């Protein structure tokens, strides 16, 4: 090679139809701007508690949440990951995904890094003028490390998004790799002694069993000078397909129509038939009604939430069941109540350097799923189901207890664009998660992280204050590429009536998506979740 | 490669004669000077109305034209196109084209880009001296994008010429690619309310359906470091040949000579025979005359023009039929009347940096075609064609109505040099253009555009005011090459009398074409249209 | 598909300077470098430039056509009035080719009883729009601005010409006609309106 | 021949016109309904 | 036959995709109610 262009830049998405099946080949390739690696050394330190973490009462137990005291091992490794949807799909493309095909399981993954360019800063000047001269270093080391064995702890999520940029023509900088170590954050709210105020039991770190897995201590690492292309790795997924449709179908809609007389007038308004002929749940003679009838299944489970969960180990929130609040008064622009599982998402540079400057938010409702709705306190548990109406006692209007049971059937909020995560690592645990909230796929193991760092370039004298002045300031750039293969089964119409096709939500409107006169724009949010369906 | 010279510079035109057929192989190769790409981002904005666009009456409806309010999507892509004739033919060569062969259909097209050289500016100095040091970057990315599928909207025309330069030894900079988006410019002249003055109905842009086809979202893009040659693409035209001759033959010349007696004196001056023996158009006994006789065809169609056409969508001009005004008083240097289809052409650097500085103009008449001439108001439509002479009523001297009819046969103004367009894209429409004014060829699709841009090279810190200071100022240079293959059938003499051979027009004279003592010169205009012919 | 693409949108962007402010609002470049239609030195503007084609043709309509053989209407070119004030619920003007359709039993035996109507605009096609009287034909195209005479604001003459390219209003549901019989005639219809 | 997306921005998909609204298409309580009008003409395109 | 059901009623529309090309097979089948034929004879007359 020796400089000859070694690589190709292909950003395209090309569908295939054999009509039983839909194969989706979506390329992506994007520039990357990497510099140091400020300090060459693995470090370990405690982040401070948090911005609003309570210093003193009377905030009492209320504000005990939203504190982020963790201990990390900051390392000089930058990782880049494809888990965002927006990486692989232009919005106009993601339409054709959710319109045509009702489920997709990723199949094959491939990626390659070409071609590296590394250049260094040289400052020359007296201080009346400082002339920075950017000159290539043809001898420079960009060292890339692949994990096919998943030995490294899993840092790859779109939680704290920090993923290679969505906009193909914009150069996207990488996050810095760090992962958690054993800590004890435990705080109490009882306090039982001390009613009503909070204490900090034990902090902040435990050195006895701590695990430091200094990298370069596991995995074969490759060196790349200008003109060579690290490739590839060949990954083959196996995963359960995930349906794109959303179910408006809910409990009390699953079985047959409760018999009734058709109305004579237009329209009715009626009418209902009393004497049936159906099962009932209790000892119930009268009235037999569609409110109580046996059904082989139950959809949705009330959850006691929001639940602040105090573990070692937190405060953290334990998720509930995703459902819309639309059947209730909650809607954008009032009354806004969050009681479902509704997760706001913070973004960067959707309008950046305008500057907003802070921030780009979304908070989907998520409005399309009305089936599974359980508003915990609305439910009521009563002792006797006897057809006789219920007495004063035996009826408890507000109770928050978990209703999840072996009969239930529930759905996550599924793939959502752009900011979703195509996959996440199934934990290794004797019991396994039955369904993963916010992740459409779980894997025994996924394609491992891809690690990249510029190898250090030292000045002659490395001994004193090397971090302050040891090595020559440097930044590299290179193109990253990727290939995905999705399989699908497209949906042919099950309706006579016209569908309501996917489009950006009422909150969004068009001219914000198409670039601004100065070239700033945001991407739409369009789950995905597109098409209603039966059950 | 790694620098070894990878390419060839061949500018030559070599005819072939097998005598039934004339194969013309015309190479071209020319330097290109490209820099940034001022802003990295796709943008969309509204151009202002126009220089002379009416602000207020009493200009009233008169000046409603010559306003250019459009909305474009400026993109950082420069395209280069061969559509000029002058690119492929030296004037002395284009002679042998129009002299020998009467029609030519382009056949095969090929082009290749070698060899790229990219170097960056580095400014070093205190301000008492600023020393710019131009140093190569052997690591730099010139990325070339080809469309064989014509997915991009068609931007390639010599309208707004902006084509790779004509003069082979001069380095020609490229235009910047941008294309129109849905707008509403509609203005009125009636006004009907409001007699005689103009309003602006709706402006300027419509965001509902707007199409943003951000590139790099369709097409495989290639990277070129110094020392590699992007090639090629192989295009094969199929198109209808276009005749080089012009027809002085007009209506009333097509059929046989009206019988007449030869003159005895030298010369006559006569004489005409009254009693014939021929068809007539009306009920016409007397006189039967060559003015009225049936002919299988009609040449030319009067058009109501000039017609300012107000659409969404304009003001624009809808063309008429090309014809000369020479049979009428109109000629260069008086009386100059434009009533035909006569299109002036603005040029650059024919004398540049002299400076004229503005501008080089031409305005062909176009004088050679006398056959199709229709001066709209000259015609008259009368009700009764009875041999009895016409009464006071029934004769309307001035009327502007379109005479185009299924009998007519018309010709464009054909290939014209240098500034013509060898091809233009036939629109995609259920009805298709029958003939294309100013373009000698239409294609189901042509060889697509060739897109080129220097990939950005960022300074270490890209975050603040990147456009103002983000990436290092840069400019590239590379040689562009091309190959055409024309087929032809040469004309052998149909005359006894000596032809009048093609030459530069009386307006032009020789020593302006041959370079000036300081090296400035203009190219001649010589359609092409060269040789008279029958019909 | 429908073509919003119309004349004056087909060729390249008239060169212009990008705006510094957000958003512009500008700006336009005067000195070009392009073809012009007449003898036109100033200003060279995107209003007048040569293009290989023309989209749409003004038609004199509505035209009541009296033949043996009628009264009948001879169609025009289909296009929307949306760029003009015409829209459903005002101002409703029909000046395009816009064909109302009467239906049966969409609500029948209710009874409406009469009738079920539609009248598409048809709004989606903005490209081909020609409102006949809006156009004006002027004699001299000289860069000098036009005099009192030579400018005729309202004229209804047919502009169809060999350069033009036009589209029907295409398949429309349910009431369209998948096919219709091409007539037997020495000249044949180039495009069939409504079929 | 199906169309693959030529755009980055999201299309505006076909639907019944503003004049029409849904519950007239789905049958009435006594079983009367009208069909929608949806050309067809659906997707904008270049030229 | 002699009455045995001789026909099928299939109203369905089934797309096919080979991806260069889309084949659409759309059936239809519908009842029809016909009576006379009030007058047996070809006639010719002028509408008002």
CA distance A81 to A452: 11
Q: What is chain C's alpha carbon radius of gyration, rounded to the nearest angstrom?
A: 22
Best residue in A1, A2, A4 to probe B by mutation, most B CBs within 10 Å?
A4
The pairing of beta strand A43-46 with beta strand B246-247: unpaired
In terms of residues, how long is chain B?
Answer: 535
Q: How far apart are the first and last CA of chain E?
A: 49
Q: Which residues of D touch E (CB under 8 A)?
A: 1-2
Residues in B closer than 8 angstroms to A520, CB to CB, are: 41
DSSP lists the bridge partners of residue B242 as: B104
Phi/psi region, residue B365 (left: phi>0; alpha: psi -120 to 50; beta: rest), is alpha
CA B530 – CA B533 distance, rounded (Å): 10
CA gap A330, A364 in Å, rounded: 12
Q: Do chains B and E touch (3 or more CB pairs under 8 A)?
A: no
Yes or no: say if B369 and B324 are a contact pair by the CB < 8 Å rule: yes
Neighboring chains of B (3 or more beta-carbon pairs < 8 A) = A, C, D
Among chain A residues, the shortest Cα distance to B216 is held by: A11
Paired sense of beta strands B230-236 and B101-113, if any: antiparallel
d(CA A356, CA A138): 40
User: Which residue bears the tokens 């036939």?
Assistant: B426
Find out whether B343 and B391 touch, Cβ atoms under 8 Å: no
Subunits in contact with chain C (3 or more CB pairs closer than 8 Å): A, B, D
Identify the bridge partners of residue A272 per DSSP, sorted by sequence position: A260
DSSP label at E42? -
With beta carbons under 8 A apart, name residues in chain B contacting D46: 153-154, 211
Strand partners, A123: A132
Where does residue A201 fall: left (phi above 0), alpha (psi -120 to 50 degrees), or beta otherwise? alpha
- In B165-269, beta strands by DSSP E: 176-180, 187-191, 195-200, 221-224, 230-236, 242-243, 246-247
Determine contact, residues A22/A107, Cβ cutoff 8 Å: no
D8–A266 C-beta distance less than 8 A: no
In angstroms, how far is the first alpha carbon of chain B from the final one? Answer: 58
SS3 B188: strand
DSSP B470-506: TB--EEEEEEEEEEEEEEEEEPPP--SSPP------T
Give SS3 for B141.
coil
Asked if A35 contacts E38 with a C-beta cutoff of 8 angstroms, the reply is no
The CA distance from B494 to C106, in Å, is 72
What would the two tokens of residue C49 be?
């430039």
What SS3 class is residue A159? coil
Residue B339's Cα: distance from chain center in Å?
19
Resolution value, angstrom units = 3.8
Number of Cβ within a 10 Å radius of residue B84: 21
In sequence order, what E strands does B254-394 have?
Answer: 298-299, 307-309, 316-317, 381-382
Distance in angstroms (rounded) separating the CA atoms of residues B438 and B411: 10
> Which residues on chain A are in Cβ contact (under 8 Å) with B457?
477
Chain A CB contacts of C110 below 8 Å: 266
Q: Are B93 and B26 in contact (CB under 8 A)?
A: yes
Hey, what are A34's tokens?
A: 């990497």
Backbone angles phi, psi at D22, to 5 degrees: -60, -55
Q: Do B429 and D47 touch (CB under 8 A)?
A: yes
Residues 6 or more apart whose CB falls under 8 angstroms from that of B137 comprise A136, B118, B119, B120, B457, B474
Exposed, middle or buried: residue C101 (CB in 10 Å: 0-12, 13-18, 19+)?
Answer: middle
- Chain C residues within 8 A (CB-CB) of chain A? 19, 22-25, 110
Q: In this structure, are residues A399 and A380 in contact, taking their beta carbons and an 8 Å threshold?
A: yes
* d(C-alpha B205, C-alpha C4), whole Å: 13
SS3 D22: helix
DSSP output for B368-422 = T--TT---GGG--EES---SSPP-STTEES--------TTEE-------TTT-BS
What is d(CA B454, CA B451) in angstroms, rounded to the nearest whole number? 11
- DSSP letters of A339-406? -S------BSSTTTTTT--S-B------TT--TT---GGG--EES---SSPP-STTEES--------T
- Closest among B121, D27, B505 to A134, alpha carbons compared: B121
CA dihedral B80, B84, B90, B95 (to 10 degrees): 160
Q: Nearest-CA neighbor of B155 among B449, B451, B521, B475?
A: B449
Chains B and D touch (3+ CB pairs under 8 A): yes
Which residues does B272 contact at the CB level (< 8 Å), separation at least 6? B258, B260, B261
| CB-nearest partner of B208 from D12, D45, D47 | D12
Phi (first) and psi of residue A455, to 5 degrees: -65, 145
B487 contacts: CB under 8 Å, gap ≥ 6: B21, B22, B23, B24, B104, B105, B107
Tokens of B505: 């027009």
Q: Which residue of E has its CA nearest to A24?
A: E19
Q: Which residues of A touch B222 (CB under 8 A)?
A: 5, 8-9
Residue by residue, what is the 3-state secondary structure of B431-471?
A: CCCCCCCCCCCEECCCCCCEEEEECCCECCCCCCCCCCCCE
For B192, the token pair is 């009907």
Alpha-carbon distances of C193 from C3, C60, C86, rounded to whole Å? 17, 16, 22
CB-based contact B507:B360 (threshold 8 Å): no
Nearest to B159 among C7, C30, C49 (CB): C49
Strands A43-46 and A71-80: antiparallel
Look up tokens 């190959």; give the residue.
B483
Q: Are A475 and B173 in contact (CB under 8 A)?
A: no
Per DSSP, the three-state class of C57 is coil
Q: Evaluate whether B199 touches C51 at the Cβ level (below 8 Å).
A: no
E19 interaction partners in chain D (CB closer than 8 Å): 2
Inter-residue contact A105 to A241 (CB < 8 Å): yes
Q: From CA B506, how far away is CA B333, in angstroms rounded?
A: 11
Cα–Cα distance for residue pair C41/C49, rounded to 1 Å: 12
The CA distance from B372 to B247, in Å, is 8
Tell me the residue ranges of DSSP E strands in A138-186. Answer: 142-146, 176-180
Determine the Cα–Cα distance for residues B317 and B438; give it in Å rounded to an integer. 14
Question: What's phi and psi for B247, nearest 5 deg?
Answer: -105, 105
Instruction: Kindly report the nearest CA distance between residue D5 and chain E, in angstroms.
Output: 14
What is the Cα A278 distance to its own chain's centre? 45
Cis preceding-peptide flag for B191 (omega within 30 of 0): yes
Give the count of alpha carbons within 13 A of A158, CB side only: 26
**Could you tell me how far CA A390 lies from the centroid of its own chain?**
45
Q: Which residues contact A264 (CB under 8 A, 6 or more apart)?
A: none
Cβ separation D44–B428 shorter than 8 A: no
Distance CA C195, CA B485 (A): 42
């Amino acid at each position: 090679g020796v400089g000859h262009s070694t690589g190709d830049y292909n950003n395209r998405t090309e569908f295939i139809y054999h009509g039983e099946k839909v194969t989706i080949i979506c390329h992506s390739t994007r520039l990357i701007h990497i510099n140091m690696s400020d300090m060459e050394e693995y470090r370990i330190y405690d982040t401070d508690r948090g911005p609003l973490f309570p210093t003193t009462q009377d905030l009492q137990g209320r504000d005990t949440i939203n504190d982020s005291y963790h201990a990390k091992v900051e390392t000089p490794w930058k990782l880049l990951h494809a888990n965002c949807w927006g990486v692989w799909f232009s919005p106009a493309d993601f339409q054709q995904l959710i319109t045509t095909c009702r489920e997709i399981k990723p199949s094959e993954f491939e990626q390659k890094i070409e071609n590296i360019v590394i250049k260094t800063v040289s400052k020359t000047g007296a201080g009346e003028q400082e002339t920075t001269q950017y000159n290539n270093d043809l001898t420079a080391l960009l060292q890339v490390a692949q994990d096919n064995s998943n030995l490294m702890p899993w840092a790859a999520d779109n939680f704290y998004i920090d993923s290679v940029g969505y906009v193909p023509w914009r150069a996207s900088k990488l996050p810095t790799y760090c992962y958690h170590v054993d800590t004890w954050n435990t705080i109490d709210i009882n306090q039982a002694d001390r009613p009503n105020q909070w204490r900090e039991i034990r902090k902040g770190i435990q050195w006895d069993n701590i695990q430091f897995t200094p990298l370069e201590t596991m995995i074969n690492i490759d060196l790349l000078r200008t003109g060579d292309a690290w490739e590839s790795g060949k990954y083959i997924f196996n995963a359960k397909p995930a349906s794109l449709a959303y179910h408006w179908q809910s409990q009390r809609h699953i079985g047959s129509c409760h018999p009734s007389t058709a109305p004579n007038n237009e329209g009715g308004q009626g009418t209902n038939i009393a004497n049936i002929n159906c099962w009932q749940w209790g000892d119930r003679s009268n009235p037999s009604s569609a409110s109580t009838r046996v059904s082989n299944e139950h959809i949705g489970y009330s959850w006691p939430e929001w639940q602040i969960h105090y573990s070692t180990g937190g405060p953290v929130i334990n998720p509930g069941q995703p459902f819309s609040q639309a059947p209730w008064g909650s809607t954008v622009a009032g009354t806004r109540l969050t009681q479902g599982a509704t997760e706001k998402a913070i973004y960067d540079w959707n309008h950046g350097d305008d500057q907003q400057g802070m921030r780009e938010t979304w908070w989907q409702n998520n409005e399309h799923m009305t089936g599974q709705t359980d508003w915990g306190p609305k439910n009521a548990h009563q002792s006797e189901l006897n057809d006789h109406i219920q007495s004063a006692s035996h009826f408890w209007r507000n109770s928050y207890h978990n209703t999840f049971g072996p009969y239930t059937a529930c759905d996550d909020h599924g793939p959502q664009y752009p900011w979703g995560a195509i996959w996440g690592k199934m934990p290794d645990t004797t019991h396994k998660p039955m369904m993963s909230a916010h992740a459409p796929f779980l894997l025994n193991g996924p394609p491992g992280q891809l690690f990249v760092k510029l190898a250090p370039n030292y000045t002659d004298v490395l001994d004193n204050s090397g971090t302050h002045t040891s090595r020559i300031v440097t930044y590299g750039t290179f193109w990253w590429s990727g290939k995905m293969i999705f399989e699908a089964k497209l949906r042919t119409p099950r309706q006579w009536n016209t569908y309501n096709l996917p489009t950006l939500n009422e909150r969004e409107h068009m001219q914000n998506t198409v670039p601004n006169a100065v070239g700033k724009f945001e991407l739409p949010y369009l789950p995905g979740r597109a098409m209603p369906n039966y059950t």
